[PDB]
Amino acid sequence: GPGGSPYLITGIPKDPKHPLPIRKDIDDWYLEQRIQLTLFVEALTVIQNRPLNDQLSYFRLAGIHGAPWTEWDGVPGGQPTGFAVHNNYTFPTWFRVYVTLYEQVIYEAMLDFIKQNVPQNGKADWENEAKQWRLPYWDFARFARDELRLPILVTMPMVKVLVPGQPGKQLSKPNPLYRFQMQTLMGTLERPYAITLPFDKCQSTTKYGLLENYNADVWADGGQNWLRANLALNEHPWYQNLDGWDSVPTLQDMTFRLLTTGGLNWGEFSSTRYDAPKNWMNLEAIHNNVHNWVGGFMFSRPGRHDLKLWGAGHMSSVPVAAYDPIFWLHHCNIDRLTAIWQTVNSGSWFNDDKSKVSKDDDLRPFHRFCEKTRKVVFFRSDDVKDWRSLNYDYAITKDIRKEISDLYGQRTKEVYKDFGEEDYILSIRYSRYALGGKPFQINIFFGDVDGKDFYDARSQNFVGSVFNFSVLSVSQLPARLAVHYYKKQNKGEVPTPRYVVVNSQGKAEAEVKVEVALHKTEGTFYDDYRRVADGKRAEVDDAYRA
């Protein structure tokens, strides 16, 4: 680390005046504001502007996750793969430490900002705010203040901040949560940091900004299509856009199921890794879909289209997702979901034969000082079982089942209530390597598939998607409402789930194996699943075949 010593990750140091401060919902935090906003903007701006040799630079911190796969804090890189854990049971705990690192670095930069900028009269007051600040989370599954949305702050190119010593003075500055921008294309950074979808041709992170058939200089900064991201985040079955039907965002239904379903062991909950389908709704699968929906992954689509609903961006891409500032807010909420699930599943910690094996893994590259052995070591999962050992908390884990229902279950229950006491789910199992490491999206349909439109909620008969953000991998989709609509159109027949595997060119991959099945139970989930139909690959138009 800096100074040639390991960087010890502690979380923000304990101050008895500041007992377990909470990580707040970033929309709530923003709306209530403004010293903490100022501190966060100014500190993160400094961190983003730090040199590439500075290991606490935003680029280097993002770089721990994936590309450009260099060392960090003396820990060799070049494994290509990054330090991040994906498709394994230490997914939640590796990221718990990662998110704490980011938060700690920000806090330390806040302290430096105060020392260099804040007059004597205000220093204790600014330090108090730095000490009470924690990294906000993005609640991707909560309705914004009828729909899910990206954080308000993320959709603002500029932000007004205080100017210490100039009371009332405010200045509008570039918002470091809107994008991460470098001084040149990331493909041309000094060795060994070059990033080399045309991500090499990006200077800034983008959401849905990268499309084929535009000048390559447009990719330098493809912009933040936050409206398109919001639309994706609100994915739901296609039939729900017809008159006479109510919609439910699939992401909120999934998250409510995740938090409320009992009986999963840690290995089931923690990861997509697969080595009963009812238990395949897992944290990592939901997190993977959100990555897709925020960033976009399709660069192109075959044929002629005036309205272009595709476009790719950093959040969909494992190697470069960590550069988008929303990455950290996303992972802060994944940490929060982990803490919530831990709270209502108190005994289920690396408790199954498969995850037990990974419990003791070093969470490289993150260092801590072991007090018992007097050695600098790597974090291990047990070190962060209690997130409060890192000196943060969440309001929801301060005391939880009613909160979960209030935040994530109202609309699902409101709409499910209109239909019979049955549940349906879709099980999805695939290999993350079926396209040679390349990402892909699995779309499921009930009924005939439009051979030129097999993509999203506007696609005829669309039920839902599973994103391969990249042993097998599993996910699960709600299917109850989509089955009801199908049955009403088909004399009560159970639909055959039809699936298309879509690549980044918007083309259907015919040799990617996906095991899809529909399962039914009597009774609603939020109050015995049997398989009722086997999936089948759908064919698409010849011009849309990979």
β-pairing, 440-446 vs 462-468, is antiparallel
| Helix/strand/coil percent split, the chain, to 5 | 35, 15, 45
Consecutive H or E run containing 265: none
* Span 72-131, contacts to ligand [O-][O-] by CB under 6 A: 84, 86
CA-CA distance, 177 to 184, in Å (whole number)? 19
Residue 67 contact, options ligand [O-][O-], Cu ion, a copy of itself, none, Cβ 5-8 Å cut-off depending on partner type: none
Report in angstroms the alpha-carbon separations of 399 from 90, 162, 273, 343, 498: 26, 35, 31, 9, 43
Contact pattern for ligand [O-][O-] over residues 308 through 327, marking x by CB under 6 A: -------------x------
Which residues, 6 or more positions from 257, have their beta carbon under 8 angstroms from its beta carbon?
281, 476, 478, 525
Residue whose C-beta lies closest to ligand [O-][O-]: 321
Consecutive H or E run containing 271: none
Consecutive H or E run containing 424: strand 422-430
Q: Which residues are at the interface with Cu ion (CB under 5 A)? A: 84
Contact call for residue 325 and a copy of itself (CB under 8 A): no
Residue with tokens 């009371």: 167
Cα end-to-end span (Å), the chain: 46
CA-CA distance, 8 to 29, in Å (whole number)? 28
Report in angstroms the alpha-carbon separations of 214 from 169, 219, 222, 223: 42, 8, 10, 13
Task: Compare residues 146 and 511 and give the one whose CB is closer to a copy of itself.
Answer: 146
Residue 527 contact, options Cu ion, a copy of itself, ligand [O-][O-], none, Cβ 5-8 Å cut-off depending on partner type: none
Contact call for residue 156 and a copy of itself (CB under 8 A): yes
**Is there a contact between 443 and 459 (Cβ–Cβ < 8 Å)?**
yes
* Span 169-198, contacts to a copy of itself by CB under 8 A: 171-172, 181, 183-184
Task: Compare residues 94 and 113 and give the one whose CB is closer to Cu ion.
Answer: 94
Q: Whole-number minimum distance, CB 51 to a copy of itself, in Å?
A: 17
Q: Whole-number minimum distance, CB 300 to ligand [O-][O-], in Å?
A: 24
Q: Whole-number minimum distance, CB 98 to ligand [O-][O-], in Å?
A: 9
Task: Compare residues 39 and 220 and give the one whose CB is closer to a copy of itself.
Answer: 220
Q: What is the DSSP letter of 539?
A: P
- CA-closest candidate to residue 363, choices 106, 111, 175, 93: 93
Single out the residue of 13, 157, 263, 437 in contact with a copy of itself (rule: CB under 8 A). 157
* Span 448-487, contacts to a copy of itself by CB under 8 A: 452, 457-458
Contact call for residue 231 and a copy of itself (CB under 8 A): yes
Task: Compare residues 153 and 533 and give the one whose CB is closer to a copy of itself.
Answer: 153
User: Does residue 11 come out as left (phi exceeding 0), alpha (psi in the -120 to 50 range) or beta?
Assistant: left
* Span 257-316, contacts to a copy of itself by CB under 8 A: 304, 306-308, 311
Contact call for residue 220 and a copy of itself (CB under 8 A): yes
Q: Which residues contact ligand [O-][O-] by CB under 6 A?
A: 84, 86, 321
Residues that bind a copy of itself (CB under 8 A): 30-31, 146-147, 152, 155-159, 171-172, 181, 183-184, 203-204, 211, 214-215, 217-218, 220-221, 223-227, 231, 234, 236, 241, 243, 247, 304, 306-308, 311, 452, 457-458
